[PDB]
Amino acid sequence: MQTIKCVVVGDGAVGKTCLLISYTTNKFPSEYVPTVFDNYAVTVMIGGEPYTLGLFDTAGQEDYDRLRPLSYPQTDVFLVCFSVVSPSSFENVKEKWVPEITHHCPKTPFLLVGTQIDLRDDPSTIEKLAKNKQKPITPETAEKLARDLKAVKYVECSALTQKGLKNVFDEAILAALEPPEPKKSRRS
Amino acid sequence: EEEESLAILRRHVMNELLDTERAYVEELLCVLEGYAAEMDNPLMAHLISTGLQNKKNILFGNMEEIYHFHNRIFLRELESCIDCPELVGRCFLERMEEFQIYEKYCQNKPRSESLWRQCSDCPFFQECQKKLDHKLSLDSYLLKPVQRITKYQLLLKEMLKYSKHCEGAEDLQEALSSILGILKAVNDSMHLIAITGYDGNLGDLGKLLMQGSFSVWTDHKKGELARFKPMQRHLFLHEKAVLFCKKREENGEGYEKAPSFSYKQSLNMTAVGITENVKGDTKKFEIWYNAREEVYIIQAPTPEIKAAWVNEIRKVLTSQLQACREASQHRALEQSH
Incomplete structure (x- = not known):
């Protein structure tokens, strides 16, 4: 049975773990957000055939540049995450994450994933960012970065409301089924 | 409650x-x-x-x-x-x-x-x-x-x-x-x-206290250089020395993606000195050698990394002094004729 290894990378606190929990349990952790997400196997049906979507979290490894890459080998698709209400996590996408997974896995496609979109339109959040002259990242901005970094595409979601959550992973499946081609420039 | x-x-x-x-x-x-x-x-x-x-x-x-x-x-x-x-x-x-x-x-x-x-x-x-x-x-x-x-x-x-x-x-x-x-x-x-080309035992250098990648500048006493455009080096702070290596970036077959480093030189801690602040950048500091006949301007990726390096170097310089002192006293305790 073919397996699609999907590894989720990105700064700590962008909700990598959170996003995985919500997709696999189809419900958001109300009173306690688990810290741990062990390697998980989701059976998915691709054109009548069964496949294993192997999900991998990287939470807690963000600071160790030598331990972190030990997860990269055999990856079929990367989800590069940044929170749409954290400009720094966004900055780290082009500055740290894409360069790294690109180096280790040249032929491996990756998606740009904006998270916590449910906060994007929240006074307190808008407000907090203002205190540092910052604003939430817009879909347009993110889409531009995705085109520039050669991400297969840009998708965004909310682990809390689950908006676009399912779609993030469908796109990851689609990206993983494409013939092993090197990062090609994107339209749109 | x-x-x-x-x-x-x-x-x-x-x-x-x-x-x-x-x-x-x-x-x-x-x-x-x-x-x-x-x-x-x-x-x-x-x-x-x-x-x-x-x-x-x-x-x-x-x-x-x-x-x-x-x-x-x-x-x-x-x-x-x-x-x-x-x-x-x-x-x-x-x-x-x-x-x-x-x-x-x-x-x-x-x-x-x-x-x-x-x-x-x-x-x-x-x-x-x-x-x-x-x-x-x-x-x-x-x-x-x-x-x-x-x-x-x-x-x-x-x-x-x-x-x-x-x-x-x-x-x-x-x-x-x-x-x-x-x-x-x-x-x-x-x-x-991952260090390559080190003729000698790395364990003789003592504990590895810190390691990182930096933009380095040279400002050596007139008499590899990086005068205006910094060079990139990966430094290893050991108890007895600071190692300068260059990130090799050649995969080949099998493609060993984890970067390896080429040993370039060592600065013996006994002759190492340090300057905490460099004008224009809170994340720069200097590691100099032999009363400055050699001066390296290191730019850390963040002010915190810079601070951590400085403090670690200072602890090593401090222990080196204490050690050096306890040694002279065991030598001076020879006043027994």
Whole structure:
């Protein structure tokens, strides 16, 4: 049975773990957000055939540049995450994450994933960012970065409301089924 | 009441710590018996050469030792904290040395990977997997230890968050720092073994205190240079010297993606000096040599990294002085005719 290894990378606190929990349990952790997400196997049906979507979290490894890459080998698709209400996590996408997974896995496609979109339109959040002259990242901005970094595409979601959550992973499946081609420039 | 909300949350963290600990232990055993053991099962000897069978220890590193520690010692002790989760920090402090075993495992992981790349197709594995009814490959299980050691600091930080006014908050904080300590040392050491071209024993340099990548400038006394455009170097701060290496960026066949370093030169600590502040950049500092006949302007990626380097260098310069002094007194205590 073919397996699609999907590894989720990105700064700590962008909700990598959170996003995985919500997709696999189809419900958001109300009173306690688990810290741990062990390697998980989701059976998915691709054109009548069964496949294993192997999900991998990287939470807690963000600071160790030598331990972190030990997860990269055999990856079929990367989800590069940044929170749409954290400009720094966004900055780290082009500055740290894409360069790294690109180096280790040249032929491996990756998606740009904006998270916590449910906060994007929240006074307190808008407000907090203002205190540092910052604003939430817009879909347009993110889409531009995705085109520039050669991400297969840009998708965004909310682990809390689950908006676009399912779609993030469908796109990851689609990206993983494409013939092993090197990062090609994107339209749109 | 507040005190009550925090006790609940503390229990949540304790439960997760315990559940994931069991799963971990159980998942290690499951693979040590489901794969590692099968490499000795004659009934399977027809699916595995002797060459592979002899490389079991390269594939699994010290997973068994690690399994032993958690199965016999740790899980037991964590469970002795159910009624008082705040005291779990003491479990960690009481066993800090044992966690050193993760250093060996992580250092050997890339080696195991390289091997796995070649034999992952071997029928032996597809067979063991089927018998185990695993949807994920052995490789994913071999990653577990790496993932587990890097979860403990998250769990501790989470427990400390809901334990500020508890008896044991200090121990929690100490456990958190010690674990962060080990993770740093492990990660630091992975860079050290990637150094190439060092004619000599690296262990003679003493403990590796820090390592990192920096933009370096030279400003040596008139009489490789980086006068205006910085050069890139990876520095290793050891007790007896600072090493300058260059990130080799050549893969070749098999493509060893983890960067390796080429040794360039050493600055003996006994002649090393330091300048804490450089005009125009809070993250720059200087490591000079021989009263400045050699001056390197280092730009750290952040002001915090710069501060950490400076403090570490200063501790080394301070110990060097104390040591040098205790030496002269044992020499001067020769005033006995």
